[PDB]
Design an enzyme around this catalytic site. Structure first.
Site, short mmCIF file in Angstrom:
data_model
loop_
_atom_site.label_atom_id
_atom_site.label_comp_id
_atom_site.label_asym_id
_atom_site.label_seq_id
_atom_site.Cartn_x
_atom_site.Cartn_y
_atom_site.Cartn_z
N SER A 23 -6.27 2.80 3.55
CA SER A 23 -5.59 1.94 2.56
C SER A 23 -6.59 1.09 1.77
O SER A 23 -6.51 -0.14 1.75
CB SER A 23 -4.54 1.03 3.22
N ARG A 71 4.97 -0.71 13.32
CA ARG A 71 5.55 0.07 12.22
C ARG A 71 5.74 1.52 12.62
O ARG A 71 6.84 2.08 12.48
CB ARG A 71 4.66 -0.01 10.99
N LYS A 104 0.26 3.43 -3.01
CA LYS A 104 -0.85 4.38 -3.16
C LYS A 104 -0.32 5.81 -3.34
O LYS A 104 -1.02 6.67 -3.85
CB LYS A 104 -1.82 4.29 -1.97
N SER A 154 0.80 -1.22 0.00
CA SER A 154 0.00 0.00 0.00
C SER A 154 0.84 1.27 0.00
O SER A 154 0.26 2.34 -0.15
CB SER A 154 -0.95 0.05 1.19
C1 LIG Z 1 -4.89 -9.24 3.83
S1 LIG Z 1 -5.83 -7.77 3.74
O1 LIG Z 1 -7.22 -8.11 3.67
O2 LIG Z 1 -5.28 -6.94 2.71
C2 LIG Z 1 -5.54 -6.97 5.29
C3 LIG Z 1 -5.45 -7.74 6.45
C4 LIG Z 1 -5.27 -7.10 7.66
C5 LIG Z 1 -5.20 -5.72 7.72
C6 LIG Z 1 -5.30 -4.94 6.57
C7 LIG Z 1 -5.35 -3.46 6.65
C8 LIG Z 1 -6.44 -2.75 6.16
C9 LIG Z 1 -6.52 -1.38 6.32
C10 LIG Z 1 -5.51 -0.69 6.96
C11 LIG Z 1 -4.40 -1.37 7.44
C12 LIG Z 1 -3.28 -0.63 8.13
O3 LIG Z 1 -2.29 -1.31 8.51
O4 LIG Z 1 -3.39 0.61 8.27
C13 LIG Z 1 -4.33 -2.75 7.28
C14 LIG Z 1 -5.45 -5.59 5.34
#
Ligand SMILES: CS(=O)(=O)c1cccc(-c2cccc(C(=O)O)c2)c1
Ligand SMILES: [Cl-]
Length: 242
Positions: free
Chosen positions: A95, A227, A50, A47
């Site tokens: 995201s 992170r 983006k 991401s």
């Molecule tokens: C495998 S996934 O469905 O892409 C997935 C699993 C767990 C979490 C996230 C996610 C979605 C939105 C924001 C964030 C973040 O770290 O800010 C993380 C995406």
């Protein structure tokens, strides 16, 4: 120009993890990292892509401005914040992959490839599916390359309009207070080994800017909060933020 401080490894090992933080002092034109090798190893951007994707979509008119509403397609996904309408600001914040997948389909392979080459972005390789190459295709970028790209964006030197760059930098706004401003983007790469989390961006101070790029091993989603936490702990250690 570059200095390695292996004592910073403690920020990762104390959490039973491993990773790299890269810092760049813009005034002094000096870089710092705990691991020079990993600082230059190329990973999927996930991401963090983006940022360039937003720039390209805006400059080509795929996205009109940061208020244009991208309607939910009505397909229920497992991330609740994705099951709603978004604009560019909230899509970056949460995201929202499926919004950005549609951007890429409208950008198309030919224009996407040319623009990443113009940006000198990572290995500039979009091999794979045009709507997922940054998640499981051939594109790769290192922490040092993220900083190189971000510095161009900061100075409005990328080969897109000034307006497109100002809008994306607005959408990157993450934190602001009386002491500093952070503009950044998170990433989470799970489809190709090794699974990692990213945080890339910069810290604005009254009289300097500090760019940063970090990635770390991420075997489960339970560690995603590390992170930002580890990065800010390094920044505090180096007295870049209080
Ligand atoms: C495998 S996934 O469905 O892409 C997935 C699993 C767990 C979490 C996230 C996610 C979605 C939105 C924001 C964030 C973040 O770290 O800010 C993380 C995406
Ligand atoms: Cl702003």
């Amino acid at each position: 120009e570059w200095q390695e401080n292996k004592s910073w490894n403690a920020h990762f090992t104390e959490h039973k993890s491993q990773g790299v933080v890269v810092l760049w002092n813009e005034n002094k034109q000096q870089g710092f990292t705990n691991n020079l090798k990993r600082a230059n190893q190329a990973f999927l951007p996930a991401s963090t892509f983006k940022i360039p994707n937003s720039l390209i979509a805006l400059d080509l008119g795929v996205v009109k401005d940061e208020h244009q509403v991208f309607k939910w397609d009505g397909q229920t996904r497992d991330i609740a914040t994705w099951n709603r309408d978004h604009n560019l600001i909230t899509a970056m914040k949460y995201s929202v992959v499926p919004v950005y997948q549609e951007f890429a389909r409208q950008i198309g392979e030919a224009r996407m490839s040319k623009m990443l080459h113009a940006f000198d972005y990572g290995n500039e390789d979009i091999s794979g599916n045009v709507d997922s190459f940054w998640l499981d295709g051939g594109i790769r970028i290192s922490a040092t390359e993220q900083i190189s790209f971000l510095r161009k964006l900061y100075h409005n030197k990328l080969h897109v309009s000034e307006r497109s760059q100002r809008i994306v930098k607005q959408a990157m706004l993450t934190e602001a207070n009386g002491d500093y401003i952070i503009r950044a983007k998170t990433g989470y790469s799970t489809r190709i080994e090794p699974k990692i989390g990213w945080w890339v961006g910069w810290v604005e101070l009254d009289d300097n800017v500090w760019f940063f790029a970090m990635n770390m091993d991420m075997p489960t989603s339970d560690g995603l909060g590390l992170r930002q936490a580890i990065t800010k702990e390094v920044l505090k250690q180096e007295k870049i933020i209080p």
